[PDB]
């Protein structure tokens, strides 16, 4: 068989010391069992900020500095924050044109829901920061 399967997360199977399971050195982790070398903790500096500090079992988790929002999977790239009611596009960030909105500091502007198409009234008209909330369907 192969006894490195026995080694839990937080340790590695040391091929120099006859497959004993020693814990992970400083600034290092192993997220699964069986690993022959521990992995280096990601360090969050500059554009990023440490959210969850790294353990022996788990990597570090990086936020983005205030005014910025994590772009990719795992907060890899880092994009800037427009305010509510705006959309950052090409050439900077601009307010949403009338009839559009954005409820977050992220993303594009979507057009308002059109209530008239389901026979519905408009209970509260939309702004640039919130959508129209539609009234009761005329099937009631």
């Amino acid at each position: 068989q192969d006894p490195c399967s026995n080694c839990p997360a937080g340790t590695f199977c040391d091929n120099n010391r006859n497959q004993i399971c020693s814990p992970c050195p400083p600034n290092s982790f192993s997220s699964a069992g069986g690993q022959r070398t521990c992995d280096i903790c990601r360090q969050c500096k500059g554009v990023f900020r440490t959210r969850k500090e790294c353990s022996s079992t788990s990597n570090a988790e990086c936020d983005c500095t205030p005014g910025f929002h994590c772009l990719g999977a795992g907060c890899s790239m880092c994009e800037q924050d427009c305010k509510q009611g705006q959309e950052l596009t090409k050439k900077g960030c601009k307010d949403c044109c009338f009839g559009t909105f954005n409820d977050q500091k992220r993303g594009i502007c979507r057009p308002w829901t059109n209530c008239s198409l389901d026979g519905k009234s408009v209970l509260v008209n939309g702004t640039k920061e919130r959508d129209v909330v539609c009234g009761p369907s005329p099937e009631n």
Partner: antibody, heavy 121, light 110 residues
Framework: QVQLQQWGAGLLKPSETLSLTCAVY????????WSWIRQSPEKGLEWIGE???????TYNPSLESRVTISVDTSKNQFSLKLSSVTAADTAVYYC???????????????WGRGTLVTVSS | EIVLTQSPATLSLSPGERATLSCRAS??????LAWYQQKPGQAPRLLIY???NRATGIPARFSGSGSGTDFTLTISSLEPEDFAVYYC???????????FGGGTKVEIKR
């Protein structure tokens, strides 16, 4: 046709230091782990520790505080040093080569002849 | 540590009979267990490794079995050379441990 010869002091007073040496004849030294094992009539067979060509060591925890195992790769020799001995450390000390069939070297396939060490005031 | 306990302490059998020795681990050791024979004044000699495989010079009458916490060494038919002390040995990496049993003396029944 590999074989191990061991030698060293066999009679020590308490507080002194046990020192022993094993020499490998007729094979390579690098591919293996080399162990020291002692046998007591009181405490039986007890593994002390192991070393390889790279000087990487594992020790039995019950002994780590007074054990040292070292290697001389120029003579294919490893050696054991046990400090602050006591009557309890009287035993036959063996050197041995670890063996395993797989990715582990977890048994003992080849043994020295043993060196009896007595400690007494 | 993990402790291996052999039983019986000693075994008295007449030549040609069948010897069955036992080893019990205090927690599981999977199959990472070996048997050694030791004749008086000699070093121990490896017989069985990985619970059930003979080492190079070992004859056919030696046989091992077991996995987990209960292992048996079987000598199918005892011969004069086979009356000695038999030790079991285990190794573990989690938790790290290397230990032997207390031994079973196999003695000539008279």
């Amino acid at each position: 046709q590999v074989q191990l010869q061991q030698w060293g002091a066999g009679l020590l007073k308490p507080s002194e230091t046990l020192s022993l040496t094993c020499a490998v004849y007729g094979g390579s030294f690098s591919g293996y782990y080399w162990s020291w094992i002692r046998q007591s009539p009181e405490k039986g067979l007890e593994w002390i520790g192991e070393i390889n060509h790279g000087g990487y060591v594992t020790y039995n925890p019950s002994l780590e505080s007074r054990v040292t195992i070292s290697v001389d790769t120029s003579k294919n020799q490893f050696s054991l040093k046990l400090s602050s001995v006591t009557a309890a450390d009287t035993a036959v000390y063996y050197c041995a080569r670890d063996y395993g069939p797989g990715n582990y070297d977890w048994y003992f396939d080849l043994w020295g002849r043993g060196t009896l060490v007595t400690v007494s005031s | 540590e993990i402790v291996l306990t052999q039983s019986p302490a000693t075994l008295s059998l007449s030549p040609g009979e069948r010897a069955t020795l036992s080893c019990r681990a205090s927690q599981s050791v999977s199959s990472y267990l070996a048997w050694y024979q030791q004749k008086p004044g000699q070093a121990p000699r490896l017989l069985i490794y990985d619970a059930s495989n003979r080492a190079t010079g070992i004859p056919a009458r030696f046989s091992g079995s077991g996995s987990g916490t209960d292992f048996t060494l079987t000598i199918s038919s005892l011969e004069p050379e086979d009356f000695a002390v038999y030790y079991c040995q285990q190794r573990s990496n989690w938790p790290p441990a290397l230990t032997f049993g207390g031994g079973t003396k196999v003695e000539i029944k008279r």
